[PDB]
């Protein structure tokens, strides 16, 4: 009966972690940031509206130049916009119209997309022979593609609905490393600013911090009561925020190994589809199911603004690397640039 | 601005191509195909003619898109909202697996998935087309085996006319939204025809209702 003995040891070992986590909880984030002054009411206006998508927009990503962005939609098109002049730089038709994620290479020469086809496709923007063409199709995942982020010009990391995350090498198209340990579908991922670790939110209401080099899980964070839909890294890189289906947000610290603040309101009963931090990390922008994108003052966990300009679910969210704009996509097939 | 004026007219050339593709895509009927794996979706697809499977067929100058999601084996609720907006849902259930088990018999396993799909928050007004396949195997199997193994509360003669109509009535009883959506039930044989006609008739009723929504009557 070694199975029972292993389970008993696991329960005792799990209780040790909870005791250790509670020991280091000297105070609360709210108590520490009680003396600081609130940011006050924050108002943002729609500085631009990008039209041309004829279906629900499921993902978007900013370029490193804070000027170009790529957006995905279920009409089967990958459009590259010029956020300054609304001009459409490119329009890439996808083989499968069921696309749930986007990525823009930090170099800027590649974009990636994936979805229900379980394949992550890489496109070459800077092709000398005319227009944009596909470069590599990365296959090997069993479930749908939830997220994908370009580590470099030749390395990408993807999270799928088969409870696994994978690291690929674009040149050969093979999985260098496979990250396992989740029990539910992984719904999002976010690389660190150092691009040495990345977190992932799963449907098991757990967040796992991985090491890209070694390939093993380092920490596991719990506290959410439903599927985690969004994750993002703090600009520092030692913290991250999660957005789950229970209409709540939580801030986790890598060193503290426990949740610090909770961003929820009694008037909100709708889940969260996307989260993103500002350049300073003082603002946490979250896209909700009530057609409204909310701005949370992360230090004090108080609402500070509402981006009410969409007529349907806000699916995707992004903040420029320069920090001077916020792009918000939604299911009404429109992208809006704010402030 | 000479280069800027040339960039603007390139965006305009992109815009006209997006609209041209949108016009073509709006004229195609999107159907979602579901089942229990061995329920008979493979033979259903041939009658009309990993990841997601797209089937293309036309009927009476109408183009249909059929999507098979039987190779997912993941959390349905995390990708089932992508199919909100389909003309109809084609559901396949085998009538010969009432006694076979996957424990639990296979017939009730289909009932669990049918109940979740029919009463889904996303599918509140989409017509559901129910196909009861393997009616030929169910013909002979009911002669040698009774239906009491599947439904212990069944009280009727073990004939095809009485037993099959009981299974169909049981499936339609799970429809809680009896006034916002309609469930079409049809009986499918291994070697039969006019199945695509039944799907064509059902989508036209969806189209007629959609037309009466633009005009404001319905």
């Amino acid at each position, epitope marked *: 009966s070694e199975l029972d003995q292993l389970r008993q040891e696991a329960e005792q070992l799990k209780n040790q972690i909870r005791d250790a986590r509670k020991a280091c909880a000297d105070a609360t984030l709210s108590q520490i940031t009680n003396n600081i002054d609130p940011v006050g009411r924050i108002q943002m206006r729609t500085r631009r509206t990008l039209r041309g998508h004829l279906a629900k927009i499921y993902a978007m990503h900013w370029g490193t130049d804070s000027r170009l962005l790529v957006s995905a939609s279920q009409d089967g098109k990958l459009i590259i916009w010029d956020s300054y002049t609304t001009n459409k730089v490119h329009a890439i038709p996808l083989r499968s119209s069921w696309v749930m994620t986007c990525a823009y290479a930090p170099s800027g020469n590649y974009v990636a997309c994936g979805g229900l086809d379980n394949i992550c496709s890489i496109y070459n923007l800077k092709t000398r022979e005319g227009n944009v063409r596909v470069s590599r199709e990365l296959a090997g995942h069993t479930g749908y593609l939830s997220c994908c982020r370009f580590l470099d010009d030749n390395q990408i990391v993807t999270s799928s609905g088969d409870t696994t995350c994978a690291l690929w090498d674009i040149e050969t198209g093979q999985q260098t490393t496979t990250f396992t340990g989740h029990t539910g579908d992984v719904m999002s991922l976010s690389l660190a600013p150092d691009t040495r670790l990345f977190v992932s939110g799963a449907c098991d209401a757990s967040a796992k911090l991985w090491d890209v080099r070694e390939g093993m899980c380092r920490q596991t964070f719990t506290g959410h009561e439903s599927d985690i839909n969004a994750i993002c890294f703090f600009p520092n890189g030692n913290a991250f925020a999660t957005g789950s289906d229970d209409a709540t947000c939580r801030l986790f610290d890598l060193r503290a190994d426990q949740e610090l603040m909770t961003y929820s309101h009694d008037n909100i009963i709708c889940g969260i589809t996307s989260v993103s931090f500002s350049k300073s990390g003082r603002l946490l922008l979250a896209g909700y199911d009530d057609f409204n994108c909310n701005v949370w003052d992360a230090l004090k966990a108080d609402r500070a603004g509402v981006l009410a300009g969409h007529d349907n679910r806000v699916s995707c969210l992004g903040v420029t690397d320069d920090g001077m704009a916020v792009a918000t996509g939604s299911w009404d097939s429109f992208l809006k640039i704010w402030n | 601005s000479a*280069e800027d*004026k040339a960039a603007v007219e390139r965006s305009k050339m992109i815009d006209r191509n997006l609209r041209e593709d949108g016009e073509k895509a709006a004229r195609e009927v999107k159907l979602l195909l579901l089942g229990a794996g061995e329920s008979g979706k493979s033979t259903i697809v041939k009658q009309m003619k990993t990841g997601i499977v797209e089937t293309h067929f036309t009927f009476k100058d109408l183009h249909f898109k059929m999507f098979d999601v039987g190779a997912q084996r993941s959390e349905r609720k995390k990708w089932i909202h992508c199919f909100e907006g389909v003309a109809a849902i084609i559901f396949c259930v085998a009538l010969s697996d009432y006694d076979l088990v996957l424990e639990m018999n296979r017939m009730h396993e289909s009932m669990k998935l049918f109940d979740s799909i029919c009463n889904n928050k996303w599918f509140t007004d989409t017509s559901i087309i129910l196909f009861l396949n393997k009616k030929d195997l169910f013909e002979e199997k009911i002669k040698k085996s009774p239906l009491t193994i599947c439904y212990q509360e069944y009280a009727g003669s073990n004939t095809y006319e009485e037993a099959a109509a009981y299974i169909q009535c049981q499936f339609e009883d799970l429809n809680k939204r009896k006034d916002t959506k309609e469930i079409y039930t049809h009986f499918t044989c291994s070697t039969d025809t006019k199945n695509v006609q039944f799907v064509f008739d059902a989508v036209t009723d969806v189209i007629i209702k959609n037309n009466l929504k633009d005009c404001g009557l319905f």
Partner: single-chain antibody
Amino acid sequence: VESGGGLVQPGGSRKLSCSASGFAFSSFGMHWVRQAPEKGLEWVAYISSGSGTIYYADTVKGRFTISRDDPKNTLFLQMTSLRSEDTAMYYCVRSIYYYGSSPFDFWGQGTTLTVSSDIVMTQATSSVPVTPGESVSISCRSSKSLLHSNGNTYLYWFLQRPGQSPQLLIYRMSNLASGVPDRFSGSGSGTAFTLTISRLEAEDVGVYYCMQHLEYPLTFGAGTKL
């Protein structure tokens, strides 16, 4: 690759052709820059992508005609009244315009033909010593400051090696083209520009031309031979 055209004619009219090959010709705007037997290059015509806007040179406004056929990937140039000045080697140049594109990147082989306001680019210097291994700098000037409000200066640098078509080195006065070695560098102040070569090589010899793209009646600078 691209080439094609006629060679000889007394008076009357002649028609030039180009054959695009394997670069998605339908999404590129094409020019017809020509070069006199011993002078510098001179712009002739232009047709946009999809056959939209069309521009002609002031000296060939009525006599010339430029048209394209996206099927079969062919670019035309129809000339009706061919005077004595119209004796030059006609080049075919591609250019694509989006946010970060590099226009005038590829130039055709070109064909010769014989018969038997605007912005003036000075480029005062004409010839310099050909001693290799040094740091040669090429100066140039423009009539007006070609710095637009969006923040980019539309000055292009072309190198014509002896015996072949011109090759683009620098576009928008700061950006290096594809395939160009990192030795070439370009800086300017909107009105006066310079092109810097760190270490001269054996293949760097030739005439270096400059072009502008602010106002469309665009002119060259007669070159600076090495």
